[PDB]
A paper describes a structure:
Here we focus on human T-plastin, a member of the plastin/fimbrin family of tandem calponin-homology domain (CHD) proteins. T-plastin is a 70.8 kDa monomeric protein that functions as a key actin network stabilizer, strengthening and promoting cell protrusions by localizing to lamellipodia and filopodia. While most cross-linkers bridge filaments through the dimerization or tetramerization of subunits featuring a single actin-binding domain (ABD), plastins contain two ABDs (ABD1 and ABD2) within a single polypeptide chain, each composed of two tandem CHDs. They also feature a flexibly tethered N-terminal regulatory domain (RD) consisting of two Ca2+-binding EF-hand motifs, which inhibits bundling activity in the presence of Ca2+ while still licensing binding to single actin filaments by unclear mechanisms.
After picking and reference-free 2D classification, class averages were analyzed by projection-matching versus the plastin-decorated single filament map. This revealed both parallel and antiparallel actin bundles, thereby directly confirming that T-plastin cross-links actin filaments bidirectionally. After 3D classification, selected parallel and antiparallel bundle particles were subsequently processed independently. These particles were subjected to extensive asymmetric 3D classification, uniform refinement, and finally multibody refinement in RELION 3.1 to obtain final reconstructions of both parallel and antiparallel bundles featuring a single T-plastin bridge. Additionally, the antiparallel conformation features rotational pseudosymmetry between the two ABDs, increasing the likelihood of misaligned particles. In both bundle configurations, ABD1 and ABD2 bind their respective filaments in a similar fashion, with CH1/CH3 both oriented toward the filament minus ends. As a result, when bridging a parallel bundle, T-plastin’s actin-binding core adopts a configuration resembling a checkmark (Left), whereas the antiparallel bridge resembles a zigzag (Right). We thus speculate that the checkmark and zigzag conformations are the two bridging configurations that satisfy the spatial constraints imposed by the CH2–CH3 and CH1–CH2 linkers while also enabling CH2 H1 to refold, both of which can be accessed with approximately equal probability due to the structural flexibility of ABD1 in the prebundling state. Consistent with this model, we observed that the end-to-end distances spanned by the unresolved segments of the CH2–CH3 linker (parallel: 13.5 Å; antiparallel: 16.8 Å) and CH1–CH2 linker (parallel: 29.6 Å; antiparallel: 31.2 Å) are highly similar between the two bridge conformations, despite a 50° difference in CH2’s orientation (Bottom). However, the conformational landscape of each configuration is distinct. Both the splay (mean = −1.0°; SD = 9.1°) and skew (mean = 2.4°; SD = 9.7°) distributions of the parallel bundle are centered around ∼0°, suggesting that the checkmark configuration preferentially engages collinear filaments.
Residue numbers in the entry:
A (entry chain C), C (entry chain A): 5 to 374
B (entry chain D): 121 to 240, 269 to 310, 332 to 377, 388 to 627
Write the structure that this text describes.
């Protein structure tokens, strides 16, 4: 019939048909369960909440993410999310559609084998495929050469590609992303006396981060600007109607991407990680990688992120190289767009792992076909 | 620097690669565009070449229907280059990684393998090209593609009509006169690719009616003589009362109005010195006999001696009835049967022009819009698209006097397309409903 | 019709038509193969890169020269290069053109037989001929008396000719040429910390050699000059924008031609080899040989090479002899130019090995007719 493209991110689920230009379903990758006594008749009859229903009823629920750092850690809740995706958000029978899934690089091999077994046995898909998220971001952009910086909710990774060849030895991966920035914002919000401690309040801090945070082009004078003047302060309204104000945490939160030591990590920032990934590549392709820095994922949506990456990589390159960062407005769905993109190609229709192949090699067939 | 240097290369490649009917979907259609490099680098022409002898092969949309995404457009280059079993790129040195972008030397020479294995109206102007092939006596080549299949008969007739780069001059010698040297490469001059030899020889020979008024002739007399000439009698009738005296032209007209003539009773134009007057008298008597009984004409007090002596009243009495019969035949042969009508034929031009869509339309043959030739010139090219020829037409800027020129132009080439118009241009310039109707009927004769 | 002249050097391929004043095609004699993982669908099914296209995509390729020291060591890649030169760079059908090939002296006989078999069975050219490169270099100068010093990428050889007669017993051959100077420049570039190790980086060092190296007129004075002052220092920019500087290595590289012991060889320099070739000739013709020292090949293009050879041979001559060095600007194509001159002679048209002769005597006919 037609292929399905499900980009199971850590924080959000992107799903839809191949050939469309945007995911049909975009919902949080969460499962909610009740935490209070059912004093009202008929309201207590539902034991689990999956999609946006878990987010709207979070005041009486405990929220869990089935994926952390791009690794599926709860498989039964992941199956709840997959059933919700196929049968409630897309409303399709998976037995009729080949399904294209995505994954981060340098991931454990069992994650890819278990999701292959789940699609073939629980959902009985006719065929399936697992693609690297950063490669799909190139499939989204316009390019067969370039280094991709992907930053979603769980993982930040860099993949350099030249003429459709990857350099795996130069692939970088960092377990620092949006969820860690939210947790850091939660910690620094206590300096003003705000406290957020439940899982529901974590979603409130996520909304604050997505609404009032930005990347400073220079952190030291923004710190002085916020220390002297009030012009950087902004207000946010809590669900009970209380109002909070932040004027320094707005850029101190996203600064962790460039200074991971704010959360005790020894690793270098995303700019240095991109530069080191380029310097591991062959010297004859570095000029073309310097001119093609593709940004992808929701964590790359901060205002000023591309300008700061431009300034930092320029500060690291040999000056003669023309540094260019590409940051399309659809950065939030580049991986999904690339998946629907790849799944449409007629040359790809033989690359699917069919169920007949899986019946011979088992779940290990995914390591050979993908 | 040089803004262009290789449009001739595009033409040359088109000439040589037209052996495969589908290759022009990648290489240019002979307009000297640059679409060749990118799609040839994908190797699409390699799989196209199978269509040369057998179209039942890899279809253009079966291999690539743009299932190549907007940003990763890698896939098709390998899918089409892997089909190089056809023709075969010797140069086992390159391939898909490099041909993704292409290189000038690489492309020029892989095209060299392509060239190495690649090879193993029009007739109206072509007849003035082939008439000389008859010489003392031989068959005609027609175009240098249909009759000739090898250089044997071609050279044999070239001897009478007198490295491929120098052999093509043997055929281009008749083209040298007007400078038609290029755009017809020697490979297909020798190979005889059809579509190239058709237009080349047609356009080469493209440059290769008496509407006067006498000092004393009425419009009726001029119309009679005009239809004499238009009907195609063997003598060129200049004077009605001076060419019909032998009745030979009248007997010819009888054949044209479908009245049978027994020429064994007709004395041939080579009359013997003795008795020529009697022979002509016999011919006039036979013409009168064929005009009275089988032609069914009212000829009271007319005898053969009257036509022999050229009596104008009785001769006009016969030629106007000839007009009547011929016009009736022209109105009837357009029908399914004996019917003749004016309003079933006047709307035909209005509805057949809708096949192309032009602003001419006429309500009746008495309409004043047909005072200029715009309506006839609009209709005259609708059935024959090869005679558009709006070079000499006038529109809106015409006066009383200049429309005579376009009227004559449309009436003259009506006979070129095949409409046997036997009308004077004046009969079209004026709103004479009895004759413009015949003009339209003749145009419809070639129409349907 | 028109004979084809193909001078298959170790480093560059020179091809064209007899009667022309210069070769029409001059491209590197290399074959490239992908060295990295393809990740984008149907980008990568190309196996071999050969000409300038193998040089532009060298950042993802392993480059192989099919000819080493004037011996064809890979006959399948050599067939690829011959296919490339006949159809892509010259753009002709070989069945319609007699082909003139070149070869170094004292070469293995099977090399000449194999190229004859390839030309008559793979391309089935109507006729062919294999000529000595130094003889063609004499034809290009218009002379009929003189000793030719040919130095290309793989072999340096000396051939003395008098009144159109060669002296085969005085032919001398040295397996030291431009490629060995490149590898030695790479070896001595590490003394400043510049490391080049991939086959793609060898092309960069070759470019550096062709742009900054020169022959010292006195090696010990230039060494003292570079040891005192930086006035010999010069800079070069790498493809990633790094800038390297070399002073002393500029002339220590080409000095190996006069002192082969730099690369551990026991053989004498090109000046002594030329003098020894003259001293093996008859004493009556040595005066005419001393006045006609013809150089050819790209390795003879270094600044100061003719002045150094003039001074060194003058130091070896009986002083009363007039040493003359001939070093035309077209030195890089003298072999091809002389081959087009020879192939355009009407008297040469009966020297072609025809296919009928080969069909009877086999590949061994080349030893008789050439
Ligand atoms: N405009 C924005 N500003 C800051 N952070 C954002 C913005 N949009 C999304 N994010 C963050 O990006 C993450 C979601 O990005 P996404 O690419 O969907 O990750 P995943 O695919 O792993 O679910 C969340 O942490 C979210 O808070
Ligand atoms: N200007 C130059 N200075 C020094 N070396 C050069 C120069 N130009 C070319 N070369 C060297 O000469 C060789 C060029 O190849 P060539 O002389 O054609 O040998 P072959 O005929 O064996 O391919 C290479 O070793 C190249 O590095
Ligand atoms: Mg994600
Ligand atoms: Mg050489």
């Amino acid at each position: 019939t037609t292929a399905l493209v499900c980009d199971n991110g850590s924080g959000l689920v992107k799903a839809g048909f191949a050939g469309d230009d945007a995911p049909r379903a975009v919902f949080p990758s969460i499962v909610g369960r009740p935490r209070h006594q059912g004093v009202m008749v008929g309201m207590g009859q539902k034991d689990s909440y999956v999609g946006d229903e878990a987010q709207s009823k979070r005041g009486i629920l405990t929220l869990k993410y089935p994926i952390e750092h791009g690794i599926i850690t709860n498989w039964d809740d992941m199956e709840k999310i997959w059933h919700h995706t196929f049968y409630n958000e897309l409303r399709v029978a998976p037995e009729e559609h080949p399904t294209l899934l995505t994954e981060a690089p340098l991931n454990p091999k069992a994650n890819r084998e278990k999701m292959t077994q789940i699609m073939f046995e629980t959902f009985n898909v006719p065929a399936m495929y697992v693609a690297i998220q950063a490669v799909l971001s190139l499939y989204a952009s316009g390019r067969t050469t370039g280094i991709v910086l992907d930053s979603g909710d769980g993982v930040t990774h860099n993949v350099p590609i030249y003429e459709g060849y990857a350099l795996p030895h130069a692939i970088m991966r960092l377990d620092l992303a949006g969820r860690d920035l939210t947790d850091y914002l939660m910690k620094i919000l206590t300096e003003r006396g705000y406290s957020f401690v439940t899982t529901a309040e974590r979603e409130i801090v996520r909304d604050i981060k997505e609404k009032l945070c930005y990347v400073a082009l220079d952190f030291e004078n923004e710190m002085a600007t916020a220390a002297s003047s009030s012009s950087l302060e902004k207000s946010y309204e809590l669900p009970d109607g209380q109002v909070i104000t932040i004027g320094n945490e707005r850029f101190r939160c996203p600064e962790t991407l460039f200074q991971p030591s704010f959360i005790g990590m020894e690793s270098a920032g995303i700019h240095e990680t991109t530069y080191n990934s380029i310097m591991k590549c062959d010297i004859d392709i570095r000029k073309d990688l310097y001119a093609n820095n593709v940004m992808s994922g929701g964590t790359t949506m901060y205002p000023g992120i591309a300008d700061r990456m431009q300034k930092e990589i320029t500060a690291l390159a040999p000056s003669t190289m023309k540094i260019k960062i590409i940051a399309p407005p659809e950065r939030k769905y580049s991986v999904w767009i690339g998946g629907s993109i790849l799944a449409s190609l007629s040359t790809f229709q033989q690359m699917w792992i069919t169920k007949q192949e899986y019946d011979e090699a088992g779940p290990s067939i995914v390591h050979r076909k993908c | 620097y040089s803004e262009e240097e290789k449009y001739a290369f595009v033409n040359w490649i088109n000439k040589a690669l037209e052996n495969d009917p589908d290759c022009r979907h990648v290489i240019p259609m002979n307009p000297n565009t640059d679409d060749l490099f990118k799609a040839v680098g994908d190797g699409i022409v390699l799989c196209k070449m199978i269509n040369l002898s057998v179209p039942d092969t890899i279809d253009e949309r079966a291999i690539n229907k743009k299932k190549l995404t907007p940003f990763i457009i890698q896939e098709n280059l390998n899918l089409a280059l892997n089909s190089a079993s056809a023709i075969g790129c010797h140069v086992v040195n390159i391939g898909a990684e490099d041909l993704r972008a292409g290189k000038p030397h690489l492309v020029l020479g892989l095209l060299w393998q392509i060239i190495k294995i690649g090879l193993f109206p029009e007739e109206l102007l072509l007849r003035w090209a082939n008439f000389h092939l008859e010489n003392s006596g031989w068959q005609k080549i027609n175009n240098f593609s249909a009759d000739i299949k090898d250089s044997k008969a071609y050279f044999h007739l070239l001897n009478q009509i007198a490295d491929d780069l120098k052999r093509a001059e043997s055929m281009l010698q008749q083209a040298d006169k007007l400078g038609c040297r290029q755009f017809v490469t020697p490979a297909d001059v020798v190979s005889g690719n059809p579509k190239l030899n058709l237009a080349f020889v047609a356009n080469l020979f493209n440059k290769y009616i008496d509407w006067t008024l006498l000092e004393g002739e009425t419009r009726e007399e001029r119309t009679f003589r005009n239809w004499m000439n238009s009907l195609g009698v063997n003598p060129h009738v200049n004077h009605l009362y001076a060419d019909l005296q032998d009745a030979l032209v009248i007997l010819q007209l009888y054949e044209r109005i479908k009245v049978p003539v027994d020429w064994s009773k007709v004395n041939k134009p080579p009359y013997p010195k003795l008795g020529a007057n009697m022979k002509k008298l016999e011919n006039c008597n036979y013409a009168v006999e064929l005009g009275k009984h089988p032609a069914k004409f009212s000829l009271v007090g007319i005898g053969g001696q009257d036509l022999n002596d050229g009596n104008q009243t009785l001769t006009l009495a016969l030629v106007w009835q000839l007009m009547r019969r011929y016009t009736l035949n022209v109105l009837e042969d357009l029908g399914d049967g004996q019917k003749a009508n004016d309003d079933i034929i006047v709307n035909w031009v209005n509805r057949t022009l809708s096949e192309a869509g032009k602003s001419t339309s006429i309500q009746s043959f008495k309409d004043k819009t047909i005072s200029s030739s715009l309506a006839v010139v609009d209709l005259i090219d609708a059935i024959q698209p090869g005679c558009i020829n709006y070079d000499l037409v006038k529109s809106g800027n015409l006066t009383e006097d200049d429309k005579h020129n376009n009227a004559k132009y449309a009436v003259s080439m009506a006979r070129r397309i095949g409409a046997r118009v036997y009308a004077l241009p004046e009969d079209l310039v004026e709103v004479k409903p009895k004759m413009v109707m015949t003009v339209f009927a003749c145009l419809m004769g070639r129409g349907m």
